[PDB]
Structures are given as C-alpha cells and as structure tokens.
Write a protein that binds this ligand. Structure first.
Ligand SMILES: CCCCCCCC/C=C\CCCCCCCC(=O)O[C@H](COC(=O)CCCCCCCCCCCCCCC)COP(=O)(O)OC[C@@H](O)CO
Ligand SMILES: CCN(Cc1cccnc1)C(=O)CN(c1ccc(OC)nc1)S(=O)(=O)c1ccccc1C
Ligand SMILES: CCCCCCCCS[C@@H]1O[C@H](CO)[C@@H](O)[C@H](O)[C@H]1O
Ligand SMILES: CCCCCCCCS[C@@H]1O[C@H](CO)[C@@H](O)[C@H](O)[C@H]1O
Ligand SMILES: CCCCCCCCS[C@@H]1O[C@H](CO)[C@@H](O)[C@H](O)[C@H]1O
Ligand SMILES: CCCCCCCCS[C@@H]1O[C@H](CO)[C@@H](O)[C@H](O)[C@H]1O
Ligand SMILES: CCCCCCCCS[C@@H]1O[C@H](CO)[C@@H](O)[C@H](O)[C@H]1O
Ligand SMILES: CCCCCCCCS[C@@H]1O[C@H](CO)[C@@H](O)[C@H](O)[C@H]1O
Ligand SMILES: CCCCCCCCS[C@@H]1O[C@H](CO)[C@@H](O)[C@H](O)[C@H]1O
Ligand SMILES: CCCCCCCCS[C@@H]1O[C@H](CO)[C@@H](O)[C@H](O)[C@H]1O
Ligand SMILES: CCCCCCCCS[C@@H]1O[C@H](CO)[C@@H](O)[C@H](O)[C@H]1O
Ligand SMILES: CCCCCCCCS[C@@H]1O[C@H](CO)[C@@H](O)[C@H](O)[C@H]1O
Ligand SMILES: CCCCCCCCS[C@@H]1O[C@H](CO)[C@@H](O)[C@H](O)[C@H]1O
Ligand SMILES: CCCCCCCCS[C@@H]1O[C@H](CO)[C@@H](O)[C@H](O)[C@H]1O
Ligand code: NA
Length: 301
C-alpha cells in the first residue's frame, strides 16, 4: 500500500504546484483577473504552495517511515508552517465570504477594493504567523530508544509535549473551533444568504446591475464549491485531532493499523485540497479555464 500512497502524494504534489503557479500567473499577467476575490484566491494558492513545497514531502516521509528524519529545528518549523498555512487558507476563505456577503447582502457599508484586499491579506499572514507560535513551542523531537539517537533518526518522533493533561484538551478544543468549526459555520450561513439574494426574486428597474448579478452567480457558485471541498478535506484531520487530544482516543496497540491508515488518509486529504482548488477554478470559472487552456496549449505544451 506504500507505492499507492507515494504515487497519490506524487500526483497531488505535481498537480498542486503546477495548478497553483498557474493561478498566481493568470492573476499577475491579466488586468481583467485582478478582482478582490482573485487576489484572495492568489493568497489561498500561496498558502497551498507553502504546504505543498515544504510540508508535503516531510508528511509523506513520516507516513511511510513512522519516524521524524529532519532533526530538532525542523520538528518546530515544519509543524508551524503547516498550521500557519491552514490558518491562512481558512482566514482567506473567511475574508472572501465577508467581502461577498457585504457586497451582495449589505452593499453600502464597506468599500470592496483590490488595495484593501492586499491590506486584509497582510493582516491574515500577520495573524496566522502569530497564533501558531504556541504550536511550534510544544513541538519536540525525541528518540524512543535514546542510546541509538546518535547513529540513526529511524526511532526519532516529532510530537507535542504537554506538562499536564488539561492544557492539550483546552488548546485542541480552541484549535478546532478557530481553524474549522466557527469560520466554516459562519461561511455556510453567509453563502446561504448570498444564495437567497442572488437566486431570489428579481427587483424591477435594474440597469444593464443585471450583468454584475449574472457574473456574481457564477463566482458565488464556484466559491460555495471551494468552501464545501475545504470543509470535506479538513473534516477527517480536525475530527481525528479532537478525538485524540480532547477525548483520549486511539491509544490502544490493538487498533495501531486502523489508526495509522485513518490518520495517513486524513494527512493526504489536506494536501489533496491544494491540488483540488485550481481544478475547481478550471471547471467553474471561464476566466481561469481560458488562462489554463492558454498555458497548456501555447505558453508551453
Ligand atoms: C475564529 C473565527 C474567525 C473567523 C472570523 C471571520 C468569519 C467571517 C465569515 C463569514 C462572514 C459572514 C457572516 C454572516 C453570517 C450570516 C448569519 C445569518 O444571517 O444566518 C442566520 C441563521 O442563524 C441561525 O438560526 C443559526 C444559528 C447558528 C447555529 C449554530 C451552529 C454553530 C456554528 C458556527 C457558530 C459560530 C458563531 C460565532 C460566535 C461569535 C439568520 O438567517 P435568516 O433566518 O435571516 O435567513 C437567511 C436568509 O433567508 C436571508 O435571506
Ligand atoms: C494541531 C494541528 N493538527 C490538527 C489539524 C487540524 C486541521 C487542519 N490541520 C491540522 C494536527 O493534526 C497535527 N499536525 C499535522 C500532521 C500531519 C498533517 O498533514 C496535513 N497536518 C497536520 S502538525 O503539528 O502540523 C505536524 C506534526 C508532526 C509532523 C508534521 C506536522 C505537519
Ligand atoms: C525535492 C524532492 S521533493 C519530492 O519531489 C517529487 C517530485 O516528483 C514529489 O513527487 C515528492 O512527493 C516530493 O516528496
Ligand atoms: C512562491 C512563494 C510561495 C511560498 C509562500 C510564502 C509566501 C510568503 S507570505 C509572507 O511571510 C512573511 C514572513 O516573514 C511576511 O513578512 C509577509 O508579510 C508575508 O506576506
Ligand atoms: C529554519 C531551519 C532551516 C535550516 C536547515 S536545518 C538542516 O536541514 C536539513 C534538511 O534536509 C536537516 O536534515 C538537518 O538535520 C538540519 O540541520
Ligand atoms: C446604513 C445602514 C445599513 C445597514 C442596515 C442593516 C439592515 C438589516 S437587514 C437584516 O440583515 C440580516 C443579515 O443579512 C438578515 O438576516 C435579516 O433578515 C435582515 O433583515
Ligand atoms: C479575526 C480576523 C483576523 C484577520 C486579520 C485581518 C484584519 C483586517 S486588516 C485590514 O483590512 C482592511 C479591510 O478589511 C484593509 O483596508 C486594511 O488596510 C487592513 O489593514
Ligand atoms: C513571525 C513569528 C516567528 C516565530 C515563529 C517560531 C517558528 C519556530 S522556531 C522556534 O519557536 C519556538 C517557539 O514557538 C521556540 O521553542 C524555539 O526557540 C524556536 O527555535
Ligand atoms: C518546550 C516544552 C513543550 C511545552 S510544555 C508547556 O509548557 C508551558 C509552560 O511551562 C505550559 O503552559 C503548558 O501547560 C505545557 O504544555
Ligand atoms: C473550552 C475548552 C474546553 C475543553 C474541554 C476539556 C474536556 C476534556 S475531558 C475532562 O477533562 C478534565 C481534566 O482532564 C477531567 O477532570 C474530566 O473528568 C474529563 O471528563
Ligand atoms: C469544544 C470542541 C471539541 C468538542 C466537540 C465534541 C462535542 C461532544 S459532546 C457529546 O454529544 C453527544 C451527542 O450524542 C453525547 O452523547 C455526549 O454525551 C457528549 O459528550
Ligand atoms: C466534530 C469532532 C468532535 C467529535 C464529536 C463526536 C462526539 C465524540 S464521541 C466520544 O467518544 C469517546 C469514546 O467512546 C468518549 O471518550 C467521549 O465521551 C465521547 O464524547
Ligand atoms: C463526521 C464524523 C464524526 C464521527 C464522530 C465519531 C465519534 C464516535 S466515538 C465512539 O464510537 C463507538 C463506535 O463503536 C461507539 O460505541 C461510542 O459510543 C462512541 O463514543
Ligand atoms: C465550551 C465547552 C466545551 C465542552 C466539550 C466537552 C464535552 C464533554 S463530554 C465528556 O468529557 C470528556 C471530553 O470533554 C470525555 O473524556 C468524556 O468521555 C465525556 O463523557
Ligand atoms: Na488547503
């Protein structure tokens, strides 16, 4: 099953790096692509490239070897970068939802500009980089057999170190709510209201307002799919983390094989999400589809 896992990780790594570079390039090279949503979708691609390039190979080696082969320093740095990336992704999706909700449901309160989106993007990185410092603090690299640590990294493990049994329960309950449940629950409600507004009863006297509304339905439909695919890809890892850290599950040696498989699939799924988003844009955005088609047909075959 290791060949199947390596191949799946290789496929995801290649599709994510190519797909996400194409998203960044399409927006950078084309003025018509520089919309508020597409600036945030570029930020999602930057967070997804950070995870794919630096964290995906380390995660594939842990899932294959059942050991940490990158030393003490990277045992703090790689978990930190993976968590920062999840925070940038979820906060980016939250700010898109917020932008679309105000623009469509409450149009005359806040100004939606590309320059304000760049300020929001910097804020997302500033917040994500700071709130994940406690995650890096608890990461520790230890050898299961101390007397062999000097000759091999085979029996070395990277894991969280907690001084008491209550602190990880409080921390991981907050982690789940902040990185998954509260932003996705709020986004679901925002998109339900956007759905009712865009697909609801047409108000008469609207100007050739008609074009923006048609364009908005296409974008909202795409964004709802991105949010639903994010919710599904991050559901196993989020649930497994809570059950392990808060409810003290998966500690029995008899279950080792079932637990290994479930956690390994949940780790791959996170990375599969970085590969999924450019594929979603290709099928649900004629603008991105046109750019990707140009990239594979004449920019470079
Ligand atoms: C750390 C977080 C950081 C992220 C922060 C950024 C997150 C920003 C994301 C999006 C911004 C947009 C938010 C807008 C949310 C809009 C919420 C909303 O209005 O829906 C309500 C449903 O409530 C309801 O009964 C349902 C009540 C909630 C159900 C409980 C599930 C909890 C999951 C989530 C809980 C989070 C709460 C956060 C607490 C501060 C009322 O609808 P209503 O009837 O008018 O009909 C709808 C339709 O028919 C209108 O045409
Ligand atoms: C507390 C963080 N967490 C929960 C979580 C909920 C939702 C989204 N991501 C992570 C974990 O499961 C723990 N971690 C994890 C493991 C593999 C992986 O593959 C996508 N993703 C995250 S970790 O601290 O970032 C870590 C730990 C040890 C080795 C490598 C890494 C990246
Ligand atoms: C630099 C080596 S990273 C390595 O590069 C491969 C490229 O093919 C990927 O497929 C793997 O997943 C990844 O670990
Ligand atoms: C091709 C690039 C893909 C890798 C993704 C990483 C993007 C860099 S985010 C960057 O992190 C810095 C931390 O020092 C902050 O100073 C910046 O304000 C913030 O914007
Ligand atoms: C920020 C820290 C980045 C500096 C590189 S640390 C260096 O990186 C190798 C990766 O291959 C490990 O194998 C080694 O053990 C380790 O010493
Ligand atoms: C200049 C001030 C303009 C801002 C005034 C806000 C008007 C409140 S509308 C209110 O908004 C909610 C969220 O969309 C819906 O759930 C409700 O059903 C709907 O009645
Ligand atoms: C819990 C929320 C944490 C996410 C951090 C982002 C905070 C918003 S930054 C702020 O956003 C404005 C528009 O939103 C821009 O006009 C500004 O120039 C910029 O500085
Ligand atoms: C922009 C904010 C940058 C700081 C993020 C830290 C990245 C992991 S390095 C690591 O951080 C730990 C505390 O988190 C400490 O135990 C170590 O001394 C230090 O080597
Ligand atoms: C580096 C060692 C790993 C972090 S242990 C961490 O240390 C804190 C201060 O001692 C306490 O607040 C927590 O309860 C405890 O989990
Ligand atoms: C807002 C954060 C809320 C986190 C929820 C923590 C619940 C974990 S189980 C709970 O933990 C206690 C301390 O270990 C024990 O006294 C109880 O017997 C046990 O049932
Ligand atoms: C704070 C974030 C992490 C915690 C989320 C898990 C909530 C579990 S509550 C759970 O609901 C069940 C429903 O059937 C009851 O049977 C149980 O008695 C009760 O334990
Ligand atoms: C959405 C992610 C949060 C998980 C919510 C599902 C409810 C958790 S069932 C959990 O099962 C354990 C083993 O029987 C017990 O220790 C706990 O009492 C019980 O609560
Ligand atoms: C979105 C998916 C959420 C799934 C949450 C899983 C929580 C189930 S834990 C555990 O499972 C056992 C099955 O045998 C039951 O006997 C126990 O009563 C229960 O505590
Ligand atoms: C904001 C508060 C959030 C509270 C969510 C905790 C749900 C309590 S279920 C209860 O407690 C422990 C897990 O918390 C488990 O060890 C037990 O098996 C289970 O029966
Ligand atoms: Na992602």
């Amino acid at each position: 099953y290791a060949w199947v896992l390596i191949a799946a990780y290789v496929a995801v790594f290649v599709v994510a790096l190519v797909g996400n570079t194409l998203v960044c390039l399409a927006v950078w090279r084309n003025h018509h692509m520089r919309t508020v949503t597409n600036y945030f979708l570029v930020n999602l691609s930057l967070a997804d490239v950070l995870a794919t390039a630096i964290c995906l190979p380390a995660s594939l080696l842990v899932d294959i070897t059942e050991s940490w082969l990158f030393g003490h320093a990277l045992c703090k740095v790689i978990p930190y970068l993976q968590t920062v990336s999840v925070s940038v992704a979820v906060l980016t999706l939250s700010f898109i939802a917020l932008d679309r909700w105000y623009a469509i449901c409450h149009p005359l309160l806040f100004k939606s500009t590309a320059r304000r989106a760049l300020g929001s993007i910097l804020g997302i990185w500033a917040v994500s980089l700071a709130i994940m410092v406690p995650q890096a603090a608890v990461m520790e690299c230890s050898s299961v057999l101390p007397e062999l640590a000097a000759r091999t990294r085979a029996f070395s493990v990277c894991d969280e170190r907690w001084a008491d049994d209550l602190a990880p329960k409080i921390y991981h309950s907050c982690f789940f709510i902040v990185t998954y449940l509260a932003p996705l629950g709020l986004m679901a409600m925002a998109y339900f209201q956007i759905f009712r507004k865009l697909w609801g009863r047409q108000i008469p006297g609207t100007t050739s307002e008609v074009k923006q509304m048609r364009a908005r339905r296409k974008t909202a439909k795409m964004l709802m799919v991105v949010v639903l695919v994010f919710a599904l890809c991050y559901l196993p890892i989020s649930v497994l983390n809570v059950l392990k850290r808060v409810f003290g599950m998966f500690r029995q040696a008899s279950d080792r094989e079932a637990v290994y498989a479930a956690f390994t699939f949940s780790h791959w799924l996170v990375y599969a999400n970085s590969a999924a988003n450019p594929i979603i844009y290709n099928f649900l955005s004629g603008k991105f589809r046109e750019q990707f088609k140009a990239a594979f047909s004449w920019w470079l075959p």
